[PDB]
Design a binder for these strands. Structure first.
Lengths: 100, 86, 212, 151, 127, 99
RNA sequence: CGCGAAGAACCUUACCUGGUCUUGACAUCCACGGAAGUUUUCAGAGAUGAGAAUGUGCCUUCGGGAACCGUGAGACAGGUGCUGCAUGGCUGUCGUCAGCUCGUGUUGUGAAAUGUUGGGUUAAGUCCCGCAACGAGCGCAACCCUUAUCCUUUGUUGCCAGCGGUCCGGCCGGGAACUCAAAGGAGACUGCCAGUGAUAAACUGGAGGAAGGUGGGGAUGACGUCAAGUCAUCAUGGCCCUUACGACCAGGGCUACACACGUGCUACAAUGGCGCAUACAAAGAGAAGCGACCUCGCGAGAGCAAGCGGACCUCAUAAAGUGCGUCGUAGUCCGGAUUGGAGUCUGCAACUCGACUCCAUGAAGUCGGAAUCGCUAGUAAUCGUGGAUCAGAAUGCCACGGUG
RNA sequence: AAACGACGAAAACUACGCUUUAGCAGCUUAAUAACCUGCUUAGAGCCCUCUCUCCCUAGCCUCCGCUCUUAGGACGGGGAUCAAGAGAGGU
């Protein structure tokens, strides 16, 4: 991928982890039905106050080694090409050709 | 549509503009890039120059539109004619 | 594509893995990220040294990278100081403390990675690819390998159109899954592009499968 | 088809009666692998037409089937737009299968109360040489003599 | 101490015990009228018994699991065939002639990659 | 009371581990119930190995995980000393359950 | 042409309209001043412009160092800008076709030929015979993975041949034969019996076997052809910009007004949808995740949540079918496409742009012209389910099964 | 449009290096040879290093964390250095 794109991922994840404490304890008020609409509205408007890419939903899953949005495996953490290369070279334990 | 638990969704900077427009002196249109902000009765009468992608288009707000997004009254792409309407 | 990688087709039969550990995918991604980082750091550092391969074991709260190399003395250093120097960086990169092992590889001209290495250096220092490959294959045949196959492709001799040349001696049964088909790749960064080199070394027929 | 001369796979033992011809007929009738519904429908039509005729069930089915089992069909082993048609006498193995296929094709042509009633009429009239399968067979037999220059 | 025979057809396991008791049938804490749906299964789970005289001569306490209705029927058939063979040692020839000893090894084929089914391929683009 | 579970990628590295643990339990204690296997899990992956437009070049990769379980043989204090030893060769995950 | 994309509201995202930066978002060398950092007020769509209460973190002889930021540059950083007609790597096609070659010898001055042709035989350059051929390599097979039978080793979370009681439930005492779990072996090797053939190779039938000629499937894809496809996974030689093709943010577009083409789904109806009971599977997932039960719900779901890193607990009474009525060939109790009203879940935020739920509305269609596509056995059809990336989004993809 | 390909007669990564024999192997009509050779057996002369052979000390810990602590150990610190030597290796 691009250097700017890769830096965007770390910049988003850092601010998402830093503000994770506020996001959960702020959406808790919204989720709590037993609350006043005056505090519900305040919580709703205060959540849009923090910077946008501060949520886990606003980040992608580019592969660590190279960087590729389309094509990824959560268990392996790399794109399809890199996963195949690692499997063929033996870097992934207990991974062989499936044939049933 | 959005769940009624969270209620209407508007921009934070939009509330300040709406308050300043009604209090006091509205002569210039309210310039907002936000289109997801729901319309409120406070904005009735006031001019909203809503951005659609190229340039802000003026929208005159009446009581008919309340439970609709402000971006609905803003075409995204210009249409003139498919058969080369010159 | 014509040929599949001959390692990961018999990894489960006769060939050993280059990474031996376990995970429940709670930490699998970070484990391979760490393995990739340590492998690339070792490759970048031990450039002059002819590193044969890098195996990694990851026991509980510790790691053990068993580098196999042809000339271990350069990595070892006097009184074993260089290994201690380069062990702390690996330990702090991987988090858990490390214990680096070094294994000398007998017959340095019979290893796939070793024979794929230094031919790129010859190409960089402008040694003719044909004579280089011929010397490599004849030395490998003389040392005892039953079959050697060397392919070199891409901008050979600084020409205008890239091609693919290859030499082969003895027998290279790529289709059988009961033989040592140790294979590795390498690339050369010359003045007019990049040259790809592939080497297949068939040593013998390992009867009985894994574990001898 | 080119070098292999296949045999024949065994058919269901027909648990109700034991007729391999009946098993072939129900296998031709069934579609989408839904054996249960097709077998129920064919059994109901089986009973209805047997009790409408009066004679024994299978002994009437065989005589109604042999009366529209064709003898000679017409084929065309020609290539190109121009075609020559040659009559070929059907073997007994394919004769019953073709007759059953014609019967099931003609069955789904009447707007009766149910599929069983659709089957029953065109299955019973075959004994008296009436219906649609017999109507098409008496023209298939004429096709052979329509142009029998090459045989 | 009564011996028995085991039977499987596609993916179903059925084991049936043989005892001198005359014609007491219960299929996995059920009966033929319970595990039913079509007469074909009932007929096919009694063919070794209906062969010569064993219709009402020894009871059938089988319990069967897995597969579908036809798979369970085939598994029960193979199990009773093996049980009768082990019990008598002379009905094996008749069972081989009827084709009951030979277990049907046919199972569902795997789905290939690029194909919509095991052998059905996507339609060619009008070329 | 106590049980030991072993997860392995290959059976070669787990059969010897089970043999070692049962011989240690025989040295310290007796009355072993034997290592019981559990249904192994096979995680599949489909990777299209072509780095561009070709939805016909696929590879099927498989990760196998085998489970072994060893229960109590003689619950005492000495039998835990020989079982709380250093971990075995890398590649075998050992879980200790107590209750 | 349901291709990269294993799944676009901002993210991804490059394009456009608007705003900002000139050693930069992303490194190394630096001179300083402060460790950082933690809440926060305004302008602003944000990028960043200011303003504060602050932290005064651990380190020797203290002009200190980790490390963090701000200012000033310089090399430099940067490009999804181009050149797959410079390439590495990877991949498609012929084709899982059966051929492609070499060493020695021989033949012809020589390009070259034999070997590789000819006779049987085959899935096959598989084997035999004959022959200036003799051998070998890449190759077609086997070794590798799954399944089809049996034996043994060890029985919990998996089973109940035998017994006891019962809360009739595997409930648990207990029983380690079985269904099953996953390890090692036996086992099918033309082995034999006849016929055929050239006294062979090989073929046809059969006593045995779960199995018969590769038992049934998968992986394995030669020499090479297509300047075949990717310089936008990545790397790489020149060429191009360094106040801009580079860097940051907000809103739109990839999902679009007259159409055509391709691959799939719903269907057309009495083989059917409808209302109420009721069985039969396998393979997989689960830790800020799967999520039992109770209660509100006509509903997607909501409060409550136990158990579960998982043979234990969930996802998840599988459908087809089977039982009974009902619909009688019908603008149909057929098709659920369009449209209006109000919501439920996930997501700072579904108007551009997800899905589920209710009410109503009820487009076509009523078996499809030339010309075409796949399949020879648990295969074609028909029914349901799981899983990949994923906050949510399949009629697609990848696999299990039921019937067949 | 286009597309040819001649010299490690630049043994060029330097294993301490350099020796004889022991047998396999390519060389062959055939048994030596030059070696094309990877080892195996033997001696180290030697460029090199390490434990060293000096003395003192008893320096000796190890279970229970530490306290004189017991069977026993292969157990054990400081200092300048060598004549020859007993063993391991070759950064």
């Amino acid at each position: 991928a691009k250097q700017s794109m890769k830096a965007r991922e770390v910049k988003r994840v850092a601010l998402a982890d830093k503000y994770f404490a506020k996001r959960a304890e702020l959406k808790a008020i919204i989720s709590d039905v037993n609350a006043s609409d005056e505090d519900r509205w305040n919580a709703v408007l205060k959540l849009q106050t923090l910077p946008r890419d501060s949520s886990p939903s606003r980040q992608r899953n580019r592969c660590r080694q190279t960087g590729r949005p389309h094509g990824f495996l959560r268990k392996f953490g790399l794109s399809r090409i890199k996963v195949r290369e690692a499997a063929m070279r033996g870097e992934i334990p207990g991974l062989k050709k499936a044939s049933w | 549509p959005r769940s009624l638990k969270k209620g209407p969704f508007i921009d934070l900077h939009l509330l300040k503009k709406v308050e300043k427009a009604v209090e006091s002196g509205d002569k210039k249109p309210l310039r907002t890039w936000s289109r997801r902000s729901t319309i409120f009765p406070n904005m009735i009468g006031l001019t909203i120059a809503v951005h659609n992608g190229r340039q802000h288009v003026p929208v005159f707000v009446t009581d008919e539109m309340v439970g609709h997004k402000l971006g609905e009254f803003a075409p995204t792409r210009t249409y003139r004619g498919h058969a080369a309407d010159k | 594509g014509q040929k599949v990688h001959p390692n990961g087709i018999r990894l489960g039969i006769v060939k050993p893995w280059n990474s031996t550990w376990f995970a429940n995918t709670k930490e699998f991604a970070d484990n391979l990220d760490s393995d990739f980082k340590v492998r690339q750091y070792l490759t970048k550092e031990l450039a002059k040294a002819s590193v044969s391969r890098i195996v990694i074991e990851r026991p509980a709260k510790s790691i053990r990278v068993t580098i196999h190399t042809a000339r271990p003395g350069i990595v070892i250093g006097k009184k074993g100081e260089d290994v201690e120097k380069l062990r702390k960086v690996v330990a702090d990169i991987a988090g858990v403390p490390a214990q680096i092992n070094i294994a000398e590889v007998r017959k340095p001209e019979l290893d796939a990675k070793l024979v794929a290495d230094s031919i790129t250096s010859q190409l960089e220092r402008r040694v003719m690819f044909r004579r280089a490959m011929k010397r490599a294959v004849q030395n490998a045949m003389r040392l005892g390998a039953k079959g050697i196959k060397v392919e070199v492709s891409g901008r050979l001799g600084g020409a205008e159109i890239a091609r693919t040349e290859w030499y082969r001696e003895g027998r290279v049964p790529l289709h059988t899954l009961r033989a040592d088909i140790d294979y590795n790749t390498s690339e050369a960064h010359t003045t007019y592009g990049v040259i790809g080199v592939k080497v297949w070394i068939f040593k013998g027929e390992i009867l009985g499968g894994m574990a001898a | 088809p080119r070098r292999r001369v296949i045999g024949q796979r065994k058919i269901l033992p027909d648990p109700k009666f034991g007729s391999e011809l009946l098993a072939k007929f129900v296998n031709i009738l069934m579609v989408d692998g839904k054996k249960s519904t097709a077998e129920s429908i064919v059994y109901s039509a089986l009973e209805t037409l047997a009790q409408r005729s009066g004679k024994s069930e299978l002994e009437a089915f065989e005589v109604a089937l042999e009366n529209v089992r064709p003898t000679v069909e017409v084929k065309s082993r020609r290539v190109g737009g121009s075609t020559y048609q040659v009559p070929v006498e059907v073997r007994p193995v394919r004769r019953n299968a073709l007759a059953m296929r014609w019967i099931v094709e003609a069955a789904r042509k009447r707007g009766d109360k149910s599929m069983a009633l659709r089957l029953a009429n065109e299955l019973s009239d075959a004994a008296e040489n009436k219906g649609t399968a017999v109507k098409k067979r008496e023209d298939v037999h004429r096709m052979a003599e329509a142009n029998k220059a090459f045989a | 101490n009564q011996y028995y025979g085991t039977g499987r057809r596609k993916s179903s396991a059925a084991r049936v015990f043989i005892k001198p008791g005359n014609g007491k049938i219960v299929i996995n804490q059920r009966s033929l009228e319970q595990y039913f749906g079509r007469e074909t299964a009932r007929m096919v789970v009694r063919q070794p018994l209906e062969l010569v005289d064993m219709v009402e001569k020894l009871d059938l306490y089988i319990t069967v699991k897995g597969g579908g209705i036809s798979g369970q029927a085939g598994a029960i058939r193979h199990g009773i065939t093996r049980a009768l063979m082990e019990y008598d040692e002379s009905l094996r020839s008749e069972l081989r002639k009827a084709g009951f000893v030979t277990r049907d090894a046919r199972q569902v084929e795997r789905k290939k990659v690029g194909l919509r089914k095991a052998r059905r391929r996507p339609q060619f683009s009008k070329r | 009371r106590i049980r030991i579970r072993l997860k392995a990628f290959d059976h070669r590295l787990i059969d010897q581990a089970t043999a070692e643990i049962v011989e240690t339990a025989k040295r310290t204690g007796a009355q072993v119930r034997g290592p019981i296997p559990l249904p192994t899990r096979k995680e599949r992956f489909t990777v299209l190995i072509s780095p561009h437009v070709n939805k016909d070049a696929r590879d099927q990769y498989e990760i196998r995980t085998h489970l072994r379980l060893v229960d109590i043989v003689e619950p005492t204090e000495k039998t835990v000393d020989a079982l709380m030893r250093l971990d075995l060769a890398a590649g075998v995950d050992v879980q200790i359950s107590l209750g």
